[PDB]
Every structure is written in C-alpha cells, then in structure tokens.
Design a protein around this ligand. Structure first.
Ligand SMILES: C[C@H](CS)C(=O)N[C@@H](Cc1ccccc1)B(O)O
Length: 264
C-alpha cells in the first residue's frame, strides 16, 4: 500500500506530534487511501467490535448462545463498565454484553465475553480464521491499554483492521442474520461522535467502534460508512505518540478521517 499524495497526512501528523495510521477503501470502486496503513498501533478498545463479531460467529454453532444469561459478580466490574455496573443485580445476556462492549466500550462486558471465547488467544484465533494475520490480542482489560511504543502485544494495523471489518460486515465471514446484527450494533455506537462520525456528512449512515488507551496519545476509530446510493466505505484511523503523558486527540482522528474521505 502506498499514497503519492501523502503530504496532507504528513502535515497533520507533524501538527499532532505523534503517529497517525489511516486505511480507507471504497468497496464499490476499489480505491484506497493509505498512511502508515501497515504499521502496528495499539487496539485499545477497538478489539471489542471484533470480539462481538467472534461471539456472533460462535452463535452460528451453538444455538441459544446470544440469549444465555451471565450472572456476573461485582469483582468483574473493572473501571469504565457503565452498562455492566447498571445491570449488576440482574446479570446480562451474552447479546447484551456484546452490545455494551461495542456501543459503550464496556470493559467488564469485554472481559466476560473474552472468557467465553477462550481469552485473548481465542479472539486472535478467530481473527486468524477469517484471514487476518496481523491482529493480535494478548491481554485483558485494562492491561491491554499500556500502549508502550514498539510493543506488539494487543496491536494491529489500520489495513488489517479495515480488511477484517469489511469481511465481517459486508463479506461472508458471518451468516446474514449475524452480519446484520454486527452492523446494527456498530450503527448504535455512542462513543464515536467526535471521531470518524464527525468527518462524515450527516446524511450518510455510519457504524463505528472507538478505542482510547489513556496513555501515549493513543486512540482510534474504525467505521463502515454508507454514502448516498453507493457501496459502503470502510475505514480505520489509529494514533499513538512517543511520550506516556502525550494526549490523544479526537480532532486529529476526525481530521484524518476527513482527509481519507476527501481523497476517495
Ligand atoms: C484505561 C482506559 C481509560 S482512561 C480504558 O479503560 N479504555 C477502554 C475504554 C474507555 C475509554 C475512555 C474512557 C474510559 C474507558 B479501552 O480499552 O479503550
């Protein structure tokens, strides 16, 4: 992957102070936009979209997996588990946990689903099984957020994220009802309004999944976008920075998303 008009991205990256990673594809034309698309970035919570897809895939083999109630304990509630905490007294179904992991980035819900799938290794295996050789999840929440420069644990590349997303939302990796459910969950995300969605015209339908590690200026978003009358665009925007105290920027993510959409 390459880009012979990369200077707008390079200047945005210089102004940001860190590294920016972008990959976008127009699935109707095949056109792509690329910038550090092959470089590893921390997933942060963006793994949760793929976790929900892996749960949907499994549900194709075990009838009733999605409606299975989980009565989890208080000590499942690691920080930033707003849905899991609200529903602690009732428990939650696997489907509800998946939705909360996607749409609220709920940490406890993510850890409970990971356990159901055999931990980070289990999710990584699912991703290998759809042909993603870049993705790796190694740790649970919250340890996977350490985002240490050059550490390959819990990382992927913008291109591999985009390709896997396209397979799961638009290709054949998931059966049709599962596929629609994944898309529906993404379209209902609540955490993404200042990221890719901020660059998308308000009349284009969008589903997305954010990630925010909290250190090293590391944050991200991926999305499927439906332009009017066209096949969808799929894209991924990841950031990191070299100092632990560096701030992430939602505005940088939005700006990089817009440069990608404009290039297409
Ligand atoms: C440690 C860090 C929050 S400071 C964290 O748990 N991030 C996950 C979800 C998240 C994002 C923004 C605020 C709180 C939680 B995720 O893995 O991105």
């Amino acid at each position: 992957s390459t880009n012979l008009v990369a200077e707008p991205f390079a200047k945005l990256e210089q102004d940001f102070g860190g590294s920016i990673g972008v990959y976008a594809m127009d699935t109707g034309s095949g056109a792509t936009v690329s910038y550090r698309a092959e470089e590893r970035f921390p997933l942060c919570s963006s793994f949760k979209g793929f976790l929900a897809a892996a749960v949907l895939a499994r549900s194709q083999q075990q009838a009733g997996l999605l409606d299975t109630p989980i009565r989890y304990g208080k000590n499942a509630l690691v920080p930033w588990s707003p849905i899991s905490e609200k529903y602690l007294t009732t428990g939650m179904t696997v489907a509800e946990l998946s939705a909360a992991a996607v749409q609220y980035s709920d940490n406890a819900a993510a850890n409970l689903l990971l356990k159901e799938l055999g931990g980070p290794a289990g999710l990584t295996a699912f991703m290998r099984s759809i042909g993603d050789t870049t993705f790796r999840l190694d740790r649970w929440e919250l340890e996977l957020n350490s985002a240490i420069p050059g550490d390959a644990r819990d990382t992927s590349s913008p291109r591999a994220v985009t390709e896997s997303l396209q397979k799961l939302t638009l290709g054949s990796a998931l059966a049709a009802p599962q596929r629609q459910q994944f898309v529906d969950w993404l379209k209902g995300n609540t955490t993404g309004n200042h990221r890719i969605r901020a660059a998308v015209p308000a009349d284009w339908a969008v589903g997305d999944k954010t990630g925010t590690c909290g250190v090293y200026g590391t944050a991200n978003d991926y999305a499927v976008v439906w332009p009017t009358g066209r096949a969808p665009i799929v894209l991924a925007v990841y950031t990191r920075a070299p100092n632990k105290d560096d701030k992430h920027s939602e505005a940088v993510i939005a700006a990089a998303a817009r440069l990608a959409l404009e290039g297409l």
